[PDB]
Amino acid sequence: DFSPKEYSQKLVNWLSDSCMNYPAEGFVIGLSGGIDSAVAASLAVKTGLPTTALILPSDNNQHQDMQDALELIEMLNIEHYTISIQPAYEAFLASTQSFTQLVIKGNAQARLRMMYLYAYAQQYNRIVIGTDNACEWYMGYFTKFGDGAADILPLVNLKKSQVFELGKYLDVPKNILDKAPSAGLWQGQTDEDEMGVTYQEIDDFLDGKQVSAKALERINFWHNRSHHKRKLALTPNF
Amino acid sequence: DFSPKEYSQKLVNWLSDSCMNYPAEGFVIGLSGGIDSAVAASLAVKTGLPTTALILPSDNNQHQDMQDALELIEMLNIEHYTISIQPAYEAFLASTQSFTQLVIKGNAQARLRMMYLYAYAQQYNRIVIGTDNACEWYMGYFTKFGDGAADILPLVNLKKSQVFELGKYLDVPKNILDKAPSAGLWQGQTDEDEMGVTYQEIDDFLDGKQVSAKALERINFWHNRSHHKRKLALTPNF
Ligand SMILES: Nc1ncnc2c1ncn2[C@@H]1O[C@H](COP(=O)(O)O)[C@@H](O)[C@H]1O
Ligand SMILES: Nc1ncnc2c1ncn2[C@@H]1O[C@H](COP(=O)(O)O)[C@@H](O)[C@H]1O
Ligand SMILES: [Mg+2]
Ligand SMILES: [Mg+2]
Ligand SMILES: [Mg+2]
Ligand SMILES: [Mg+2]
Ligand code: NA
Ligand code: NA
């Protein structure tokens, strides 16, 4: 059925109860300047529990995305830290020379962000909010043990269009509502160009609506190759 | 009903089939110089599929543990790399200054090792073998998204004594058989001192055998504080 006001209150209540029962003090989240993290952070703040945002740029990230995240942080009035992952990434990369890719880079960088978030989380007894929505989950458009690694996933049942509706309801900065969804691996990269299918097509597919043959091919391809990303590690039946 | 020979062959067959069906070309494993990773590496090698070992010391690690891992690699005749994680760890740790203890250090290093393993695996189409045995799993004595993060867990149904039995059967070097189980964070650190409970006690508990009230107090304390380490992230049911 979905309406932003009601679904937002249910999520706020579920985050709050989940955090108290965990048990933990509050939340930490990575703020990319994108819509999923903007929405998840806004929801976490409404619980009234301590919420901290990390901004973790690499050199491939855009200044506007940093500024959009900072603007949200100002509006939300939350504790925050901005730390470049680039020096750690560069040291890690250099140290891999004896056995050496853009995807390999993207995945290392996601895992470095996980390390920052869990470092903070352990210091302040927080839980880490993962921002995966239903489209990213189904497509496996996330890094295993990177952005796919979290304690709690408030958006994972939401269509992208529902994420946007929550954004509008929650007064997320306009530029976050209007910008192209992007992993931020290079300037001009967009999720939809990378996937070869639009979010509207994925959402329609999730809804059991007709999509084109090419959309369906891409949806099936992404979903098929990502089965292990969604499940626990394989263990013996003996 | 455990027998080293029979179980070993079952595990080797399962590793092989699991890897073939993944699909992947082979394995990668972090070798600490301890028994769990020694046994897991030996099993992987027996599948006849490409198997690479990474040795990933930090300055906290004991030189003997690197030497024992190297000794095993020589015996197994496998591709391997020895890479200090210290440069990457120091860049990471320095960068956390604004918000930032030994447990946190230990956890960051374990997640760095995860990064190395996955960087290799993705470059060479391998799957990452996790070395968690039934004791570590139950006690949650592993880092979430560090050594607890892998593609496949061949040892996770095994008691520590059964891991050692496999070690003996697989001709793992004597010093690895005889040394104290240890996370390697400082000289003289031992798992049993850390947990306050012996592996024999944990193993007996897992088997439904009587243990002391002291033992049982340490077992439930560890198991209780780690419920979420074993499971997937919390998701809404709505
Ligand atoms: N530069 C960044 N700073 C902080 N968090 C980030 C950054 N880039 C990505 N993330 C986190 O990673 C998640 C996945 O991003 P995306 O790949 O665009 O779906 C985001 O929702 C953020 O929580
Ligand atoms: N120095 C190291 N080099 C490579 N892998 C390691 C090292 N230390 C720990 N590991 C990995 O982490 C796993 C867990 O170690 P432990 O914490 O001793 O149970 C080991 O089985 C290894 O696979
Ligand atoms: Mg996203
Ligand atoms: Mg993004
Ligand atoms: Mg171990
Ligand atoms: Mg060890
Ligand atoms: Na994205
Ligand atoms: Na150990």
- Residue B234 CA to residue B15 CA, distance in Å, equals 29
CB B145 within 8 A of CB B111: yes
Residues 6 or more apart in contact with residue A55 via CB below 8 angstroms: A30, A31, A66, A69, A70, A73, A80, A81, A82, A83
C-alpha span between B217 and B44 (Å, rounded): 36
- For chains A and B, count residue pairs whose Cβ atoms are closer than 8 Å: 144
A126-128: strand order across its sheet: A79-82, A51-55, A26-30, A126-128
**A4 Cβ contact partners less than 8 Å away, ≥ 6 residues apart:** A162, A165, A166, A168, A169
Give me the amino acid identity at A230: R
Contact B89, B115 (CB under 8 A): no
Active site residue B171: no
Residue among A87, A112, A233 minimizing CB distance to B152: A233
- What is the C-alpha separation between B238 and B27, in angstroms, rounded? 39
Residue B69: what residue type? A
Protein residue whose Cα sits closest to atom 2 of ligand 2? B32
Mark the breaks in chain A: residue after which each occurs, C to N over 2.5 Å.
100
Going by the DSSP 8-state scheme, the letter that residue A129 receives in this structure is B
CB contact under 8 A, B153 and A87: no
Q: Which two tokens stand for residue A199?
A: 């979010």
DSSP A6-18: HHHHHHHHHHHHH
B227 touches A at CB < 8 Å:
no
Over its C-alpha atoms, chain B yields an Rg (Å, rounded) of: 18
Which chain B residues are within 8 Å of A236, Cβ to Cβ? 10-11, 14, 154, 156-157
Type of residue found at A206: L
What residue has token string 């192209």? Answer: A180
B140 lines ligand 2 (CB under 6 A): no
Starting from the CA of residue A179, give the closest ligand. 4
Phi, psi values for residue B203, rounded to 5°:
-65, -50
For residues A117 and A143, the answer to whether their CB atoms sit within 8 Å is no
* φ, ψ for residue A150, nearest 5 deg: -155, 175
Exposure on the CB side of residue A236, measured as CA atoms within 13 A: 23
Question: Quick check: B236 and A156 CB within 8 A?
Answer: yes
- Residue linked to tokens 């892998």: B150
d(CA B187, CA B189): 6
What is the 8-class DSSP label of residue A142? S
* CATH entry, B1-238, from 3.40.50.1220, 3.40.50.620, 3.30.70.20, 3.40.50.2300: 3.40.50.620
B95 vs A11, A88, A94: nearest CB: A88
Contact with chain A for residue B212, Cβ under 8 A: no
DSSP collapsed to 3 states, chain B: CCCHHHHHHHHHHHHHHHHHCCCCCEEEEECCCCHHHHHHHHHHHHCCCCEEEEECCCCCCCHHHHHHHHHHHHHHCCEEEECCCHHHHHHHHHHCHHHCCHHHHHHHHHHHHHHHHHHHHHHHCEEEECCCCHHHHHHCCCCCCCCCCCCECCCCCCCHHHHHHHHHHCCCCHHHHHCCCCCCCCCCCCHHHHHCCCHHHHHHHHHCCCCCHHHHHHHHHHHHCCHHHHCCCECCCC
- The three-class DSSP label of residue A50 is coil
Distances in whole angstroms, Cα of residue A164 to Cα of each of A16, A71, A122, B27, B177: 22, 18, 31, 41, 57
Contact A185/A158 with Cβ under 8 angstroms? no
**Closest CA–CA distance from residue B49 to any residue of chain A (Å):** 18
CB contact at 8 A, A194 and A117: no
Interface of A with B in 117-176 (CB under 8 A): 118-120, 122-124, 130, 144-145, 149-154, 156-157
A45 C-alpha to center of ligand 4: Å?
Answer: 20
Nearest-10 Cα torsion for B186, B190, B196, B197: 160
Resolution in A: 1.9
Method for structure elucidation: X-ray
Sheet holding B51-55, edge to edge: B79-82, B51-55, B26-30, B126-128
Ligand 7 ion: nearby residues, β-carbon < 5 Å: A 181, 183, 191
The one-character DSSP state at A199 is H
Pair A194, A211: CB distance under 8 Å: no
CA–CA separation, B20 vs B23, rounded Å? Answer: 5
The residue ranges of every structural domain in chain B are 1-238
d(CA B2, CA A68): 59
Going by C-alpha positions, the residue among A113, A108, A116, A90 that lies closest to residue B98 is A116
d(CA A115, CA A23): 21
Centre a 10 Å sphere on the Cβ of residue B82 and count the other Cβ atoms it contains. Answer: 15
CA atoms within 13 A on the CB side of A212: 8
Q: Which are the contacts of A217, defined by CB distance < 8 A and separation ≥ 6?
A: none
What is the Cα–Cα distance from A218 to A124, expressed in whole angstroms? 41
Question: Does ligand 1 have an atom closer than 6 angstroms to the CB of A32?
Answer: yes
Contacts of B20 (CB under 8 A, 6+ apart): none
Q: Which position has the token pair 């740790």?
A: B93
